Amino acid sequence: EWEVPRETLKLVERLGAGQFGEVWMGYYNGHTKVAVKSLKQGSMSPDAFLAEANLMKQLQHQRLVRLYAVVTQEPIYIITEYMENGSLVDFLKTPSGIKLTINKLLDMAAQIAEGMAFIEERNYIHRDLRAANILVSDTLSCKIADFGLPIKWTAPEAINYGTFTIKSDVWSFGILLTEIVTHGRIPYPGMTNPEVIQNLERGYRMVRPDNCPEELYQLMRLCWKERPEDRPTFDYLRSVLEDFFT
Numbered sequence: 731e732w733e734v735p736r737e738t739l740k741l742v743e744r745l746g747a748g749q750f751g752e753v754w755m756g757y758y759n760g761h762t763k764v765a766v767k768s769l770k771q772g773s774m775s776p777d778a779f780l781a782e783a784n785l786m787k788q789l790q791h792q793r794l795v796r797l798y799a800v801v802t803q804e805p806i807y808i809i810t811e812y813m814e815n816g817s818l819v820d821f822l823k824t825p826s827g828i829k830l831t832i833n834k835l836l837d838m839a840a841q842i843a844e845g846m847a848f849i850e851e852r853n854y855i856h857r858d859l860r861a862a863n864i865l866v867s868d869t870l871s872c873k874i875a876d877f878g879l880p881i882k883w884t885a886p887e888a889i890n891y892g893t894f895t896i897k898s899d900v901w902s903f904g905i906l907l908t909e910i911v912t913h914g915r916i917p918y919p920g921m922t923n924p925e926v927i928q929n930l931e932r933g934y935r936m937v938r939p940d941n942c943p944e945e946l947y948q949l950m951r952l953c954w955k956e957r958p959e960d961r962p963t964f965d966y967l968r969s970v971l972e973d974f975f976t
């Protein structure tokens with residue numbers, strides 16, 4: 731029920747390009763704006779490319795970018811809804827994003843946690859949670875997404891032994907929180923990857939960002955407990971963020 735004739739689409743602007751294909755902004759039947767991921771032929775099997783689509787059919791939730799359609803005849807396409815304000819990391823840097831209050835910022839962080847909770851509920855693992863993979867709707871709501879290919883957001887265990895789990899994602903969420911309260915600042919200000927790698931094996935943790943509440947900073951630290959099983963659940967994180975301001 732997801733297949734649609736290629737004729738229903740018009741690609742307007744290419745958002746990005748890479749090894750396995752391209753991303754375009756377009757329109758479906760001239761009335762709906764959409765983002766389109768097209769596979770560059772003979773770059774990876776149609777099967778492997780469509781696995782992304784099958785995963786999106788599975789994970790439908792208010793806090794996750796939703797799949798709209800698919801075109802299964804080469805050039806193979808994956809069509810989704812389009813978010814006017816783009817990614818969270820970019821938006822926060824605009825005047826519109828800088829003018830946002832700490833209240834609004836925690837509401838957005840709550841929404842992200844809510845979506846991750848969903849992801850947790852479904853035994854899924856994001857592997858790349860960061861503000862760049864967060865889309866901002868036209869109403870400033872937040873949806874979880876993943877565009878593709880950087881150590882700053884990865885938990886130590888994942889970095890060292892490649893152990894990516896939902897706990898690996900919680901840690902990334904902690905990093906993401908720093909992005910949200912500095913309005914787009916890169917984490918570990920001033921440090922190169924090698925430096926963040928070094929500091930970590932020493933138990934170093936990001937210093938509290940300016941204008942970051944003390945309670946919010948401790949929530950981040952919980953997300954950064956060395957032992958993965960010591961990190962909170964996204965459900966607990968959502969709950970705490972929504973009630974942050976009673």
Ligand SMILES: CCN(CC)CC(=O)Nc1ccc(C(F)(F)F)cc1NC(=O)c1ccc(C)c(-c2ccc3nc(NC)ncc3c2)c1
Nearest residue numbers: 765766767782789794795810811812813816874875876878
């Ligand atoms: C590790 C990499 N893996 C493996 C391949 C990818 C993967 O598994 N992806 C992945 C994994 C999980 C989930 C979900 F959360 F739903 F469960 C979604 C996605 N994919 C996307 O987010 C996505 C797919 C197609 C398009 C067209 C866009 C997409 C690109 C760009 C956009 N810009 C704007 N506005 C500016 N608005 C909307 C979009 C949507 C985004």
